[PDB]
């Protein structure tokens, strides 16, 4: 009744939903606490992160820095691969990915520079080629410069600066923190007080208004005690702005309009401590003596309730929710509460490899000087136990264990952690993300599924700026760990592989492990011996893939692994529309090519092992449906490749021309045609047969 | 008494080791693991692990050759016993296997150490345990470039599937993206293999992982580091000079999937690899690398993301200066 490709498409749809059901942050960080860690040595194949390269500060910057009379400062523009150094009233930028960079000098400023930041531009203000705005704050004024960071053939942005005539006198309040919103709004704060200012600017000059203005959103008056800021933090997904004070007070501001900023929550350390005391597990790691050293916003795409992470100097991660009083009039929250605490790990870093209650007393992260969190939870902590050498604790969610955990009430914030040592003299200054922000889905459920996006987006990389250089740290995927582990089994027994494989099964489950073997066998992770590793991966896919059984049948883990891998290769395509109507393609052509190559390499792998892989060759009811299921998947693969080739052919011509000379029903059918329908449903095939019959007609008119 | 009582052979081994007759102890520990005595497999793993240590250091009177002659024998068996243990552990927990057979296996495996032939055929290969199949090839010095590579391909695919099914289900915690679990299954072999050239041939495996990273779309689309295949092999201990030697071979042949505008990603890999190479030399290569980076630039113009390419060309031309 139902043909092969339609049967396999059913498996894809159900697999997509399974990946998009990955637990949301609120679900495994429920009210309570956790100390769950599995620590890995930094030199281990199971390390969750590792250093890939380093970039020294240019010698000319050292000449200027040691030529500093009063004040110097370093910072990162990780989004574009640039770093900067300010010396008194002079500023120097450079591309740290370049082996011998030239210094972009800017010395117009008259007074000491106190802060520098790179923010998005205000729309409809600048020429489209201006990609960013450079904000330079001195003790006398704030200066805006246009920036164009266009990519180069080498892979590092070319940076050119533009004057703007946009500037405003600073005033009496120091500026040490500058943050920008998605829409180009610029907010300022510093070490004089807790006030937050905003810089406005517009293209047109008016007789009653200047091109650039500044206002204090805090409207202070009367008696005020000493208190200033330690940082500013933006969350565009909620239109919120957070400030952290030197007294560890957390203030939340809501952008109720394009020019408004309203304080809506103020939560001092006493309030946090009161919440903490009402929790089941209180700890001497968090007292009235403890300082909060950093905040990290959590976007609404990642979690609904948990808005914010706060890091103590003892290494405790405080996760705070925020809630509005009502459900309708963005809606501003009015309350903030400490709900969940992740306590520090216990293992300390060691030169030599050392050998179930809540651990709420570890000092391993004491003192924590700097801290950063990146979605879906990558955590960097600069531990400064000694005044000369920083130690870097880096952890990630145990995505594999979180995904397999059952039932939902057993979910905990499992983590994989490691210690990265920096050499003597390296003082960490800043850590920034160099790759695109992580997101496996568009809502909390499914958002944190690292496994699903292993082959759709490069692993996250992070630039660690120190006083001596920039270190690149890269997140390692399951396939990276699996390939590395197998690389150590090349010179060992049949039982050596089985032992290493069992480690993966106990953490990730059998399907995820066999899917990793399939991926490695197909060359994934090789963008980083390699024939033997891929042959070992093939051996693991065959030997440990399981078999089909009567419970309606239960297909082998080898089959589910093939379906899982294939689904993840096309997850960005399946439910997407093929075209966007001047008609264009929803998916960039370059992305369609890589997807097709991946599908074809998978097909090539199955053909070259049709004789050795169980189920491919024809074979009692169990092995029968195993053969039918595997056959249907392979028919979907070739259909996927044909479908992609058809779309590429289509846009090589002039589709808008073809679309014009077309009937309405076929324009409408093409309007809402998905890749799933093209791959697995007759109407996509019938429509494809119409389009080919139409493109050739047009091709004859061009007559090439 | 050691001949018929395991716990008395224990003292004789302790007797020798307090007197510092280390070889004589490993001589008994090894000869005891190979015995016909009722000893669990996990104990025989301890015996061979102690024997490997006691036979690693010089002992007064005994040769260097007879010392290594025993260390090599013990090390071999330990590698096999570890496979056999990790195999049994997985077979017993395998839902695909009947509970009647699992008991028949456990009696056979949970004791003396069997031949790799027995471990491979009647168990490892049938269950499609591709990772443990590779460990057997390594432990058996199995010379065959194809089957080693075919097994790697199956291991990668089966791993990708298990991870994509998990991500689709989310499953207690957020599972990892596919390439992450695939990366784990290679690291597990890499440390365990000790990076033998036969079962870990970068000449072929790295293209496979890089191919998998394309054919299965493990890239920026899902938030992954596009250069995660390079980052994997470098951090695993592969020489920089070799990785760039392979990417060179990939960029010229242009065998699929490394064709068309997807070669934009090949250059990104080359930039990452070479960049990590000069940064590793300046922290502490010839004309052919400069020949490549310049040739890699033709690719970016031949492909001319309009700003990504432009920014990438200026990262390549930066490395060409750093080498010349």
């Amino acid at each position: 009744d139902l043909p092969p490709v339609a049967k396999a498409a059913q498996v894809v749809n159900q697999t997509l939903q399974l990946d998009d059901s990955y637990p949301d942050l609120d679900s495994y960080c429920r009210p309570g606490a956790s100390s769950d860690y599995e620590m890995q040595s930094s030199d281990s194949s199971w390390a969750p992160f590792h250093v890939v390269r380093h970039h020294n500060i240019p010698d000319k910057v050292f000449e200027h820095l040691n030529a500093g009379e009063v004040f110097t400062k370093l910072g990162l523009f990780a989004e574009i691969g640039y770093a900067w150094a300010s010396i008194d009233s002079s500023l120097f930028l450079w591309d740290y990915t370049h082996p011998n960079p030239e210094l972009i000098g800017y010395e117009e400023a008259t007074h000491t520079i106190t802060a520098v930041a790179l923010v998005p531009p205000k729309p409809g203000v600048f020429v489209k080629t201006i990609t960013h705005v450079l904000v330079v704050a001195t003790t006398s004024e704030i200066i805006l410069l246009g920036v164009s960071a266009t990519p180069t053939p080498s892979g590092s942005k070319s940076l050119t600066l533009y004057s703007t005539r946009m500037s405003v006198h600073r005033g009496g309040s120091d500026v040490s923190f500058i943050v920008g919103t998605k829409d180009g709004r610029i907010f300022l704060g510093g070490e004089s007080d807790t006030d937050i200012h905003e810089i406005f600017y517009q293209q047109e000059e008016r007789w009653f208004s200047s091109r650039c203005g500044k206002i204090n959103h805090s409207h202070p008056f009367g008696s005020r005690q000493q208190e200033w800021l330690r940082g500013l933090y933006v969350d565009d997904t909620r239109n919120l702005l957070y400030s952290l004070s030197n007294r560890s007070t957390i203030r939340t501001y809501h952008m109720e309009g394009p020019e408004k900023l309203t304080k809506v929550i103020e939560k001092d350390k006493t309030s946090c401590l009161r919440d903490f005391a009402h929790m089941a597990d209180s700890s001497p790691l968090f007292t009235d003596k403890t300082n909060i050293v950093a905040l990290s916003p959590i976007p609404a795409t990642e979690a609904s309730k948990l808005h914010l992470m706060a890091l103590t100097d003892t290494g405790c991660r405080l996760f705070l929710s925020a809630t509005s009083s009502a459900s309708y009039t963005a809606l501003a929250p009015q309350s903030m509460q400490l709900q969940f605490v992740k306590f520090p790990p216990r293992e300390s870093p060691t030169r030599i490899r050392t050998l179930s209650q809540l651990d709420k007393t570890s000092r391993a992260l004491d003192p924590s000087a700097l801290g950063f969190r990146f979605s879906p939870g990558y955590f960097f902590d600069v531990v400064r136990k000694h005044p000369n050498q920083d130690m870097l604790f880096v952890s990630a969610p145990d995505t594999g264990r979180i995904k397999v955990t059952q039932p939902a009430s057993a979910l905990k914030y499992f983590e994989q952690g490691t210690w990265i040592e920096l050499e003597n003299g390296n003082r960490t200054i800043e850590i920034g993300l160099t790759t695109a922000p992580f997101a496996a889905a568009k809502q909390p459920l499914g958002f944190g599924n690292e496994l699903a996006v292993q082959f759709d987006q490069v692993p996250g990389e992070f630039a660690v700026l120190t006083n001596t250089g920039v270190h690149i740290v890269r997140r390692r995927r399951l396939v990276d760990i699996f390939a590395k582990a197998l690389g150590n089994c090349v010179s060992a027994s049949d039982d050596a592989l089985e032992r290493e494989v069992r480690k993966f099964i106990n953490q990730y489950g059998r399907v995820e492990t066999i899917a990793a073997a399939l991926a490695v066998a197909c060359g994934q992770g090789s963008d980083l011996m390699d024939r033997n590793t891929e042959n070992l991966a093939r051996a693991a896919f065959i030997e440990y893939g399981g078999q089909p059984r009567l419970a309606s049948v239960r297909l082998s883990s080898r089959h589910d692994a093939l379906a899982l891998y294939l689904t993840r290769l096309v997850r960005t395509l399946w439910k997407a529309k093929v075209v966007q109507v001047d008609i264009s393609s929803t998916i960039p052509t370059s992305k369609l090519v890589t997807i097709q190559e991946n599908v074809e390499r998978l097909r090539n792998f199955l053909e070259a092992n049709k004789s050795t892989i169980q189920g491919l060759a024809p074979p009692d009811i169990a092995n029968q449906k195993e053969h039918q299921a595997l056959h249907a998947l392979q028919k979907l693969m070739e259909s996927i490749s044909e479908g992609i080739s058809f779309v590429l052919m289509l846009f090589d011509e002039r589709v808008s021309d073809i679309y014009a000379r077309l009937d309405a029903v076929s324009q409408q059918q093409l309007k809402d045609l998905t890749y799933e329908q093209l791959f697995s449903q007759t109407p996509g095939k019938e429509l494809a047969k119409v389009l080919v019959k139409a493109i050739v007609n047009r091709n004859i008119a061009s007559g090439a | 008494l050691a001949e018929t009582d395991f716990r008395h052979a224990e003292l004789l081994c302790r007797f020798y080791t307090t007197r510092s007759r280390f070889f004589e102890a490993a001589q008994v520990q090894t000869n005891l693991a190979k015995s016909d005595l009722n000893i669990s497999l996990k104990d025989r793993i301890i015996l061979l692990s102690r024997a490997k240590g006691n036979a690693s250091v010089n002992t007064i009177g005994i040769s260097r050759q007879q010392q290594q002659q025993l260390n090599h024998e013990a090390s071999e068996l330990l590698e096999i016993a570890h496979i056999q243990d990790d195999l049994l552990e997985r077979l017993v927990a395998d839902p695909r296997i009947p509970e009647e057979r699992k008991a028949e296996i456990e009696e056979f495996l949970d004791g003396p150490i069997r031949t790799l032939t027995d471990l491979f055929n009647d168990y490892a290969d049938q269950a499609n345990y591709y990772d443990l199949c590779l460990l057997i090839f390594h432990a058996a010095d199995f010379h065959n470039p194809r089957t080693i590579l075919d097994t790697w391909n199956n291991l990668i695919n089966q791993s990708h599937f298990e991870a994509e099914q998990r991500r689709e289900y989310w499953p207690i915690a957020e599972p990892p993206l596919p390439y992450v679990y695939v990366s784990q299954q290679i690291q597990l072999i890499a440390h365990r293999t000790s990076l033998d050239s036969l079962i870990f041939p970068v000449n072929s495996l790295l293209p496979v992982v890089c191919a998998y990273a394309i054919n299965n779309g493990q890239d920026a689309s899902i938030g992954a580091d596009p250069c995660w295949p390079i980052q994997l092999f470098l951090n695993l201990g592969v020489p920089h000079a070799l990785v760039v030697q392979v990417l060179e071979n990939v960029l010229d042949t242009q065998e699929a999937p490394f064709t068309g505008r997807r070669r934009k990603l090949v250059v990104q890999w080359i930039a990452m690899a070479v960049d990590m190479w000069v940064r590793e030399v300046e922290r502490r290569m010839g004309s052919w690398v400069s020949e490549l980076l310049g040739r890699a630039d033709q690719v970016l113009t031949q492909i001319a993301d309009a700003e990504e390419i432009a920014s990438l060309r200026r990262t390549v031309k930066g490395l060409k200066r750093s080498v010349d």
Partner: peptide, 17 residues
Amino acid sequence: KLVINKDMRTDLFSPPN
């Protein structure tokens, strides 16, 4: 010493006798 022999094995997925 390894010798692959896919020919005659024992069905890992069937009980004995």
